[PDB]
Amino acid sequence: YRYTGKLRPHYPLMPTRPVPSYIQRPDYADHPLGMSESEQALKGTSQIKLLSSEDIEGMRLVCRLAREVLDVAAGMIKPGVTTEEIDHAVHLACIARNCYPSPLNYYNFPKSCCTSVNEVICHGIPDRRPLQEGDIVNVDITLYRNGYHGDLNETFFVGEVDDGARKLVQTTYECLMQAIDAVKPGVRYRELGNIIQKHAQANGFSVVRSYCGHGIHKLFHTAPNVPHYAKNKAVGVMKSGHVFTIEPMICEGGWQDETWPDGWTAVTRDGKRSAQFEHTLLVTDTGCEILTRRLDSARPHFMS
Ligand SMILES: CO[C@@H](C(=O)NC[C@@H]1CCCN(C(=O)C2CC2)C1)[C@H](O)[C@@H](O)[C@H](O)/C=C/C(C)(C)C
Ligand SMILES: [Mn+2]
Ligand SMILES: [Mn+2]
Ligand code: NA
Numbered sequence: 001y002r003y004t005g006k007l008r009p010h011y012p013l014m015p016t017r018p019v020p021s022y023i024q025r026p027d028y029a030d031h032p033l034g035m036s037e038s039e040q041a042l043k044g045t046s047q048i049k050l051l052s053s054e055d056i057e058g059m060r061l062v063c064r065l066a067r068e069v070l071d072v073a074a075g076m077i078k079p080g081v082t083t084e085e086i087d088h089a090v091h092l093a094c095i096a097r098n099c100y101p102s103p104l105n106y107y108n109f110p111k112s113c114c115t116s117v118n119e120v121i122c123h124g125i126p127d128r129r130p131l132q133e134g135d136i137v138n139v140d141i142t143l144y145r146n147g148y149h150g151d152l153n154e155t156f157f158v159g160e161v162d163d164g165a166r167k168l169v170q171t172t173y174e175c176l177m178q179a180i181d182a183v184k185p186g187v188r189y190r191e192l193g194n195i196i197q198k199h200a201q202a203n204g205f206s207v208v209r210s211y212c213g214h215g216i217h218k219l220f221h222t223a224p225n226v227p228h229y230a231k232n233k234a235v236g237v238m239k240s241g242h243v244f245t246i247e248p249m250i251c252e253g254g255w256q257d258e259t260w261p262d263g264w265t266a267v268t269r270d271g272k273r274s275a276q277f278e279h280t281l282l283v284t285d286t287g288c289e290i291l292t293r294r295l296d297s298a299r300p301h302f303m304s
Contacts, residue, residue, distance in 0.1 A: 001261050005119040005271030009262060010128035013110060014084060017091045023100050026144050026220070034108040039219050048215060048223050050241040055148070055217060056282060059243055063150035063280050063291035065097045066143040070152055071294075073113065073139040074301040077156040080130045083115035086139060087126035094143055102142035102149050102220050109264065114140040114153075121208055121249045121257050121266040121274040133159040136169060138276050142220065149220045151245050152292035153278040154300050164252060165273065169302055171203045172250040172275040179228075179246045183238060183281055183288040189224045190234040196248045197230035206255035208274065211266065213245040216280055229255075238283045243291070247278030 019025070028036040051059065072093045076086050091112040094101045101112035109125075116124040116138040117131070123140075131137060140153035155169050178199055179192040197207045212234075213226035224236040228248040253272030259265065268274050277300065281288045294300075 058148035062145040066150040083126040100144040176277040208249035215244040
């Protein structure tokens with residue numbers, strides 16, 4: 001394997017972390033390959049669930065707890081902290097909230113959250129690498145509570161970063177928020193990618209094609225697919241009661257990704273940096289409710 005930049009995995013990984021049996025588990029938690037039979041039963045349907053009153057409450061709850069966990073991880077981002085240490089804090093914070101960390105054993109994903117540094121696009125595996133001054137690091141949190149998943153992420157700065165990092169991160173965050181601003185009943189899912197690419201391109205950046213936002217609720221990933229690039233052929237039209245993520249990954253260089261020999265870590269083929277933000281949204285009559293927003297602060301963590 002020829003690495004595409006300077007990042008390397010730092011092994012060994014700590015043994016899988018157990019989750020106490022009192023915490024309610026998703027179906028894939030105990031499947032030996034991490035397969036979700038409730039997602040597989042739905043494999044090739046385009047049908048989007050219309051959430052009940054009760055579903056919305058379950059989503060509001062899990063997404064708020066998820067935000068709380070992401071904020072814990074935010075507090076830990078500094079030079080010399082390892083991504084495994086961040087993941088341990090996350091795993092304990094989920095447990096404190098009587099939540100299962102949804103990534104844990106999801107298709108045999110080995111950790112409780114994803115930590116993506118610099119050229120990693122997404123799905124990096126927490127490991128022994130200490131964060132370095134100048135890094136940009138994304139923490140991607142997903143929680144499972146009472147049958148519902150809530151999924152969000154942010155990119156953070158590790159100490160002082162260069163100007164390119166500041167611009168990449170800022171534009172990525174703008175991309176997500178312009179897409180969120182367009183959400184409202186009657187809009188097609190395929191439109192969001194147009195908005196995203198239009199803004200990333202205006203700032204000299206590209207859009208990852210190989211990973212999409214997605215419906216989420218009782219399933220971790222389900223219809224609609226939500227591509228982030230222009231002229232995609234995504235199916236479906238937003239209606240009040242739809243819940244899904246938007247989670248654009250934007251890159252300094254070209255859009256092409258490849259995966260590490262670990263089968264998870266996705267990286268730019270050119271080794272240039274990539275940044276991401278994600279929220280879980282519910283479509284309402286006036287537009288949308290950002291279920292994973294901050295409640296107590298105006299801005300994402302990187303702005304402060
Ligand atoms: C960028 O990452 C997103 C992403 O892979 N989306 C695409 C969907 C991923 C799973 C497979 N897909 C499906 O539709 C199939 C129905 C299951 C595509 C993902 O949702 C992240 O936001 C999430 O936090 C990470 C989850 C792992 C535990 C998988 C690391
Ligand atoms: Mn996520
Ligand atoms: Mn997601
Ligand atoms: Na990255």
